[PDB]
C-alpha cells in the first residue's frame, strides 16, 4: 500500500464524507489497558477470559469487579493527540458542510471525551448498563457503580474475589424489574446490535474516504468494514504501528502511533 502523505492529503482535501474506524490502538496510546496483548492480564485472567457470556454466567461478581476496575481507571485517562485530531477534524469539516463519522470498537468513550459528536460505539460502553431481565440500557458513570464494589476490583495477582452475592451487584432500577445488570458491552461470541450495524452500513455505503486507525483487523465483523468501502473504489488509509492481515488491501499504510500520524493527516 502507498506510503505517501502527500497523496492522502489530496484525497482528504476533497472528501465530503469521511468514515474513521478506530480500534484499541487508539485507546492504548492513552494508556487504557486492553488486557488483550501477550502478558496483558487482570489478576490471573485476560479479557478473552472475562469478557464472555461464559464468565458472566459462572462468576458475575468477578466480571463486575473487572469492569468496575476498568471504569475506575478511566478517571486517570485522557484523550490523546489521535482522539483530539479526530475530534477537531469533525468540527472543522462540519462547519464546511462535510461529514466525519467515527466507528469505534473502543468502549472507553475517550472519543466522546475529546468532543467527537458523530460516533458509533459498535461494542458498547464501559459507562452503560443493560438489564439481563428487561433489556433496558442506561448510562451509568457512578463511582462505584454499587456500594458492594466500593474499593474492589484491585488488579494485583492474588487479590481475593469479592464474591458479591448477585443481589448486591448492580440492579435494574426500572419500576418493577430489579433484575441483574451487566455491562452494556459486546462480549466475544455475541452479536452486534443490528440497529447499530444498519447505521454503520449507511455510513460505509455513502462515504468517500475511509480511515482505519489502531485496529488489528482480526475482530469481526469490524474487520470487514473497510473492505466493503474499497470495493466501491473508495480510498482506505490504515494507521497502525504495524502491518495487519488486512494491510495489503488498503490504498495507504501509514506506519506508526496513531497520535503521531493522525494530526498530520487530518491537518
Amino acid at each position: 500500500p502507498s506510503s505517501s502523505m502527500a497523496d492522502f492529503r489530496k484525497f482528504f482535501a476533497k472528501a465530503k464524507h469521511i468514515v474513521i474506524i478506530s480500534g484499541a490502538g487508539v485507546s492504548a496510546e492513552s494508556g487504557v489497558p486492553t488486557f488483550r496483548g501477550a502478558g496483558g492480564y487482570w489478576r490471573k485472567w485476560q479479557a478473552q477470559d472475562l469478557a464472555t457470556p461464559l464468565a458472566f454466567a459462572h462468576n458475575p461478581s468477578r466480571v463486575w469487579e473487572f469492569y468496575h476496575y476498568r471504569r475506575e481507571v478511566m478517571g486517570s485517562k485522557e484523550p490523546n493527540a489521535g482522539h483530539r485530531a479526530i475530534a477537531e477534524c469533525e468540527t472543522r469539516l462540519g462547519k464546511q458542510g462535510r461529514r466525519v463519522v467515527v466507528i469505534t470498537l473502543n468502549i472507553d468513550e475517550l472519543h466522546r471525551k475529546a468532543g467527537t459528536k458523530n460516533l458509533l460505539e459498535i461494542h458498547g460502553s464501559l459507562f452503560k448498563t443493560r438489564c439481563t431481565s428487561c433489556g433496558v440500557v442506561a448510562e451509568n458513570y457512578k463511582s462505584p457503580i454499587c456500594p458492594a464494589l466500593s474499593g474492589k476490583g484491585a488488579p494485583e495477582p492474588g487479590t481475593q474475589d469479592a464474591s458479591i452475592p448477585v443481589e448486591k451487584l448492580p440492579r435494574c432500577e426500572e419500576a418493577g424489574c430489579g433484575g441483574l445488570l451487566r455491562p452494556h458491552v459486546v462480549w466475544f461470541g455475541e452479536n452486534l446490535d443490528p440497529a447499530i450495524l444498519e447505521e454503520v452500513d449507511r455510513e460505509l455505503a455513502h462515504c468517500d474516504l475511509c480511515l482505519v486507525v489502531g485496529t488489528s483487523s482480526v475482530v469481526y465483523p469490524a474487520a470487514m468494514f473497510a473492505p466493503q468501502v474499497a470495493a466501491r473504489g473508495v480510498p482506505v488509509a490504515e494507521f497502525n504501528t504495524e502491518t495487519t492481515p488486512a494491510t495489503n488491501r488498503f490504498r495507504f499504510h501509514f506506519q506508526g502511533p496513531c497520535g503521531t500520524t493522525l494530526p498530520e493527516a487530518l491537518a
Partner: peptide, 4 residues
C-alpha cells in the same frame, strides 16, 4: 454478526 457475532464478535470474533
Amino acid at each position: 454478526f457475532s464478535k470474533q
